[PDB]
Design an enzyme around this catalytic site. Structure first.
Site, PDB file in Angstrom:
ATOM      1  N   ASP A  57      -2.617   9.096   9.978  1.00 39.64           N
ATOM      2  CA  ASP A  57      -1.609   8.069  10.193  1.00 39.64           C
ATOM      3  C   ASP A  57      -0.266   8.733  10.405  1.00 39.64           C
ATOM      4  OD1 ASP A  57      -0.971   5.320  10.503  1.00 39.64           O
ATOM      5  OD2 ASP A  57      -0.530   5.070   8.365  1.00 39.64           O
ATOM      6  N   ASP A  68       2.801   9.263   3.044  1.00 37.42           N
ATOM      7  CA  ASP A  68       1.687   8.328   3.267  1.00 37.42           C
ATOM      8  C   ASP A  68       0.321   9.023   3.228  1.00 37.42           C
ATOM      9  OD1 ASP A  68       0.229   6.548   5.985  1.00 37.42           O
ATOM     10  OD2 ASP A  68       0.302   5.854   3.895  1.00 37.42           O
ATOM     11  N   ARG A  83       7.326   6.392  11.188  1.00 39.74           N
ATOM     12  CA  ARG A  83       7.481   5.501  10.036  1.00 39.74           C
ATOM     13  C   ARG A  83       6.935   6.122   8.734  1.00 39.74           C
ATOM     14  NH1 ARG A  83       3.278   3.503  13.033  1.00 39.74           N
ATOM     15  NH2 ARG A  83       1.270   3.551  11.912  1.00 39.74           N
ATOM     16  N   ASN A  84       6.047   7.114   8.868  1.00 40.95           N
ATOM     17  CA  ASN A  84       5.466   7.824   7.710  1.00 40.95           C
ATOM     18  C   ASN A  84       6.094   9.179   7.415  1.00 40.95           C
ATOM     19  OD1 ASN A  84       3.761   5.717   7.055  1.00 40.95           O
ATOM     20  ND2 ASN A  84       2.157   6.443   8.449  1.00 40.95           N
TER      21      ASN A  84
END
Length: 277
Positions: free
Chosen positions: A152, A170, A156-157
């Site tokens: 992932d 994450d 955003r992570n």
């Protein structure tokens, strides 16, 4: 080396192996800073013996959790606890029984990288942005070498601290960040993480634009199949965009490794003119 905690017959046992249990009385919750999959995420502080208070983020497991949720939630700590690198978010510890359940992580004041760059659109030089990308690549190089596949990786992570250091986050267990072989055949590897890393590069150089803008997932998939690749964002030098293209090679074995990516970015920092070639 990375141990998948889901190889344990009792996954709770892995939490206790890799994550320090913390006394809840030593944790101050100050403010809500986000919503998570499992519960609110807060900022606050942690009292350590002999040391000044450390600023922390506190991921809560909302009351009324099942055992499965507790297990899935704590898996993040049993993974993160195995790592120690400047560009990977540090785990302070966990509260797992007897008190409200929590994962306590180093505080990253500037939050998620995509939101950070949107707020600071046009305020960082190419060399500053490349420094951010180099940090993320160094974190990923470390993880890949530990045998950890992220799955992932996205801006955003990536979290950003007050010194503008970017760190991979994450570690719990999407289409437009994912390599084609991972979307279609669930072949997740460090080479599919390199595809995601290419998308992160584009997110960074665009100051947090959405990859492929408003295209549907199905249209993204078809476009990639026909050989479409995202363009160089405004002010992005050609050599840096070429590195994105290399991360997005259709054949996974042709993509650069994270060690190579680090080296390439280091060369652009030492010789910024070379970013155009």
């Amino acid at each position: 080396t990375y141990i998948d905690p889901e190889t344990y017959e009792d996954p709770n046992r892995a939490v206790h192996q890799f994550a320090k249990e913390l006394d809840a009385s030593c944790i101050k919750i100050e403010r809500v800073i986000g919503a998570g999959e499992f519960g609110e995420v807060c900022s606050g502080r942690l009292k350590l013996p002999g040391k000044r208070d450390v600023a922390v983020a506190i991921k809560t497991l909302k009351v009324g959790y099942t055992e499965k949720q507790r297990r899935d939630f704590l898996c993040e700590a049993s993974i993160m606890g195995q790592f120690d690198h400047p560009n990977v978010v540090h785990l302070e510890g966990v509260v797992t029984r007897g008190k409200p359940v929590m994962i306590v992580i180093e505080f990253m004041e500037n939050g998620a990288l995509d939101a950070f760059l949107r707020k600071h659109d046009g305020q960082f030089t190419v060399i500053q942005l490349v420094g951010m990308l180099r940090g993320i690549a160094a974190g990923m190089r470390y993880l890949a070498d530990m045998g950890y596949v992220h799955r992932d990786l996205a801006a955003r992570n990536i979290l950003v601290n007050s010194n503008l250091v970017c760190k991979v986050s994450d570690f719990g267990l999407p289409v437009r960040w994912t390599a084609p072989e991972a979307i279609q055949y669930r072949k997740f590897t460090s080479a599919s993480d390199v595809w995601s890393y290419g998308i992160v590069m584009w997110e960074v150089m665009s100051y947090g634009e959405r990859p492929y803008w408003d295209m549907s997932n199905q249209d993204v998939i078809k476009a990639i199949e026909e050989g479409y690749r995202l363009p160089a964002p405004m002010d992005c030098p050609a050599g840096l965009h070429q590195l994105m293209l290399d991360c997005w090679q259709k054949e996974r074995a042709e993509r650069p490794k994270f060690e190579q990516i680090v080296g390439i970015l280091d060369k652009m920092i030492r010789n910024p003119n070379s970013a155009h070639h």
